Design a protein around this nucleic acid. Structure first.
Ligand SMILES: [Mg+2]
Ligand SMILES: [Mg+2]
Ligand SMILES: [Mg+2]
Ligand SMILES: [Mg+2]
Ligand SMILES: [Mg+2]
Ligand SMILES: [Mg+2]
Ligand SMILES: [Mg+2]
Ligand SMILES: [Mg+2]
Ligand SMILES: [Mg+2]
Ligand SMILES: [Mg+2]
Ligand SMILES: [Mg+2]
Ligand SMILES: [Mg+2]
Ligand SMILES: [Mg+2]
Ligand SMILES: [Mg+2]
Ligand SMILES: [Mg+2]
Ligand SMILES: [Mg+2]
Ligand SMILES: [Mg+2]
Ligand SMILES: [Mg+2]
Ligand SMILES: [Mg+2]
Ligand SMILES: [Mg+2]
Ligand SMILES: [Mg+2]
Ligand SMILES: [Mg+2]
Ligand SMILES: [Mg+2]
Ligand SMILES: [Mg+2]
Ligand SMILES: [Mg+2]
Ligand SMILES: [Mg+2]
Ligand SMILES: [Zn+2]
Lengths: 81, 44, 135, 60, 122, 193
RNA sequence: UAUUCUGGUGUCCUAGGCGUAGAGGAACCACACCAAUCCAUCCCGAACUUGGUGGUUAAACUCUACUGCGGUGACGAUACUGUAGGGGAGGUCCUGCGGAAAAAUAGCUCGACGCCAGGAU
RNA sequence: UGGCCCUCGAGUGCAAAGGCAGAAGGGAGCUUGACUGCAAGACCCACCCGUCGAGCAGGGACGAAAGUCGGCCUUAGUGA
């Protein structure tokens, strides 16, 4: 009949990208369903928020064959130039 | 077979046909009185 | 008059017409054809009139395919209606054609009767067109 | 209406003001459907005072 | 949809294996039971390595106990003991039990109980 | 007028021997030879026989259900299962979980015994019998035959029966083709067409 | 130390899948058969369970092969576009410098790699 | 009720979207973590609100054990 109702954009989507740095607890992704699956060193939340357990670089992978998973690996920062 | 819930299956059932025939079958009764059966039937 | 039997939403985006139709390009049913040269919107009424004209002028000639169809709805607000309070009422239906698109196909006449017929058909169209022969 | 706020309460809690370290009467709160289940709800739940998982009944 | 016993049990093994994960400090104890043989393994999944493996196909239990057709509870107990000793001799105490798709019961259960009495922790 | 039930009446006989040992002694060499299979295990075996009663009106009155259950029991020596309807069905007045039919599965030895009591007892003691349809196979070598009423079996005592209640019987077999299943059934004494 | 084969067990991946044809029984894996005190079926020793037999590669799994299907997939060119302009009443067209598909065909594909036990050389 | 073929097209209290096949879908057994005390760090952000949470102690549930459990596949169901 008559329209005009809508909703504030929920702020979903990838918060940290590939090969960036993550603290522990830091949120990597806020998603509706699971568009990404938890990999290693990484916890999943009730709303399927994916968050880090470890300091380090976050990397996206092929869960296989189709889906995608995110995981965090520890890096080494020695090369101070 | 689970116990007490099944009707007792008596393994020995003697088939007594009125041609004084006696066979063995099995079923809950011990004997079966039969006037009409496979052998000695209208067809064949 | 051609038209879809059902849609969920009534009202629809004007859209935008760009480029060339690559797919409707070939002439795969008949022998002679009428090809769209320019990017336009064809009402079902126009297609009706074109087909009718070509059919009546061919007559003793056999076959006419219509390679298009008016599946996109179009909406209008009435006269003395102030702007606002909702999108208007769908009045008619258009087919979106882009240059290169084949409109009419025809078979069962000599090339002359076909040329004359297709010309009279093109007369009822909103667009510039072309006469083309099968390869 | 048919769905209700119900108060769960420790059965082994003595309101008299007890002599132990922490005195008080544990109550939880929760909702019940008073149509579906007319049974007065019983639930084992933790009591901060008794320190043990006690049994909490209901209140009228 | 696999109703072949084989594929079915495999399905179960994988399902179980979702939760139970071999780590350096908690190696996975993996039980395989076939018609004529009992085979057990110990795996650290990070390193992807088997630390210790005891089986009925080893001379120890062959010369100890013989059986006619199916492996007995006795057989199993013997194996649990062998792996308990073998693992306690490499410095492996704390482990997690992968029941490998077989219901925990019978010789599986007995295997577990044997390895518990002998100082392996799970 | 070809008689394979002169094999089933032939001499004073025993149960276990009849079914299970006519299978291993007689049936298997026969099938082995006439179809020429290149290993023994390719022989068609009787896997299971499920009997299914279809009565939806009995869901209205559960006493009818209990009665029919005990009847099927005394017939088959097995206390049945009461099958629930999965979906809400309007035209038949059924909602989910409602107990619709009654079903039993007979496996192993009881399958053979009940098969015997079928062919050699109740099938002749039926109403006007001709022969069972050769065309009731499903194409993969599993057979199905209906029983309009259960007065067929002697365990069912006809005067104590409240109402006539129907039964369905599905023989399931490792056979992949209907020829092999047919030879199996008829060799075992079944009355075809 | 090698190599080969069986069974277990994983990780990587282009996700190695179906089909047709072939191979495997000494060992190994499997079914087959038999009996039911631990346990087991809303009914059924079917499954799951304990204890025997000694049959068979039929099914299963396994190993080799093959483009029929399936899966994967370019180079080029075109569509589109970033920026600098130009034409058209407009719908929209065109140029220069930069990026660059989808589809389709040509090809590719009948996985890769590791540990353990057990034989064989 | 029996069986063969297609393999995710059903379902998930209720909209729609995104999820989810040996499952988040269907069943069974035992329950009350629909806990007390908290919390590194994050997201969202005018403010006010809102969301995620590793980890720690207490006292438990299930489980042989590893472990999981601070309501519910997620996002509405609210009021300083
Ligand atoms: Mg939104
Ligand atoms: Mg949680
Ligand atoms: Mg262009
Ligand atoms: Mg014109
Ligand atoms: Mg065995
Ligand atoms: Mg590839
Ligand atoms: Mg490849
Ligand atoms: Mg074979
Ligand atoms: Mg190909
Ligand atoms: Mg292809
Ligand atoms: Mg290119
Ligand atoms: Mg440009
Ligand atoms: Mg420009
Ligand atoms: Mg360019
Ligand atoms: Mg370039
Ligand atoms: Mg590309
Ligand atoms: Mg492509
Ligand atoms: Mg290979
Ligand atoms: Mg919905
Ligand atoms: Mg959906
Ligand atoms: Mg579930
Ligand atoms: Mg926690
Ligand atoms: Mg912890
Ligand atoms: Mg705790
Ligand atoms: Mg306990
Ligand atoms: Mg749930
Ligand atoms: Zn208290």
């Amino acid at each position: 009949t008559k329209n005009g109702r809508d909703s504030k954009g929920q702020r979903l989507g990838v918060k940290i990208y590939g090969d960036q740095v993550a603290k522990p607890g830091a949120i990597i992704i806020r998603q509706r369903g699971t568009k990404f699956h938890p990999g290693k060193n990484v916890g999943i939340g009730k709303d399927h928020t994916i968050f880090a357990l470890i300091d380090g670089l976050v990397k996206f992978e092929k869960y296989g064959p189709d889906k995608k998973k995110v995981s965090v690996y520890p890096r080494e920062i020695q090369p101070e130039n | 077979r689970k116990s007490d819930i099944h009707p007792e299956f008596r393994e020995d059932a003697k088939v007594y046909c009125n041609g004084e025939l006696v066979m063995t079958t099995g079923g809950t009764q011990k004997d079966y009185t039969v006037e009409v059966w496979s052998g000695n039937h209208p067809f064949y | 008059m051609l038209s879809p039997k059902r849609t969920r939403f009534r009202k629809q985006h004007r859209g935008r017409m760009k480029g060339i139709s690559y797919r409707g390009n070939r002439i795969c049913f008949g022998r002679y054809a009428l090809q769209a040269l320019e990017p336009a919107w064809i009402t079902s009424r126009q297609i009706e009139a074109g087909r009718r004209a070509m059919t009546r002028n061919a007559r003793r000639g056999g076959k006419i395919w219509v390679r298009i169809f008016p599946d996109k709805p179009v909406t209008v607000r009435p006269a003395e209606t102030r702007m606002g309070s909702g999108k208007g009422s769908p009045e008619y239906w258009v087919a979106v054609v882009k240059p290169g698109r084949i409109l009419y196909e025809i078979s069962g006449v000599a090339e002359n009767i076909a040329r004359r017929a297709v010309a009279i058909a093109a007369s009822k169209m909103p667009i510039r067109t072309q006469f083309i022969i099968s390869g | 209406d048919v769905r209700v706020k119900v108060i769960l309460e420790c059965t082994g809690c003595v309101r008299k003001s007890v002599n132990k370290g922490s005195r008080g009467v544990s109550r939880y709160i929760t909702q019940k459907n008073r149509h579906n289940t007319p049974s007065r709800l019983e639930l084992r739940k933790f009591c901060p005072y008794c320190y043990k998982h006690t049994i909490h009944g209901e209140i009228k | 949809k696999a109703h072949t016993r084989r594929e079915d049990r495999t399905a179960r093994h994988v399902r179980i294996r979702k939760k139970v994960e071999g780590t350096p400090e908690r190696p996975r104890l993996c039980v395989f039971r076939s018609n004529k043989h009992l085979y057990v393994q110990v795996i650290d999944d990070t390193k992807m390595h088997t630390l210790a493996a005891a089986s009925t196909m080893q001379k120890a239990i062959s010369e100890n106990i013989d059986y006619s057709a199916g492996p007995t509870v006795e057989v199993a107990q013997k194996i649990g003991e062998m792996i308990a000793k073998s693992c306690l001799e490499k410095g492996i105490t704390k482990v997690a039990f992968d029941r490998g798709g077989y219901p925990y019961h019978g010789r599986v259960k007995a295997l577990a109980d044997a390895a518990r009495e002998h100082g392996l922790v799970f | 007028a070809a008689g394979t039930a002169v094999f089933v009446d032939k001499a004073e006989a025993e149960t276990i021997n009849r079914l299970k040992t006519n299978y291993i002694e007689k049936m298997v060499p026969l099938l082995k030879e006439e179809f020429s299979y290149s290993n023994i295990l390719e022989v068609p075996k009787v896997v299971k026989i499920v009997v299914n009663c279809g009565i939806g009106d009995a869901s209205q009155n559960a006493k009818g259900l209990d009665a029919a259950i005990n009847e099927l029991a005394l017939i088959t020596g097995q206390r049945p299962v009461k099958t629930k309807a999965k979906t809400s069905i309007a035209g038949f007045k059924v909602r989910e979980g409602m107990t619709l039919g009654i079903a039993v599965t007979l496996r192993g030895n009881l399958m053979y015994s009940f098969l015997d009591r079928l062919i050699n007892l109740a099938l002749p003691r039926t109403r006007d019998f001709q022969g069972v349809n050769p065309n009731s196979f499903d194409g993969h070598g599993n057979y199905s035959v209906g029983f309009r009423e259960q007065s067929v079996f002697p365990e069912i005592k006809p005067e104590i029966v409240g109402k006539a209640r129907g039964m369905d019987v599905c023989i399931t077999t490792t056979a992949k083709t209907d020829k092999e299943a047919y030879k199996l059934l008829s060799l075992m004494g079944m009355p075809f067409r």
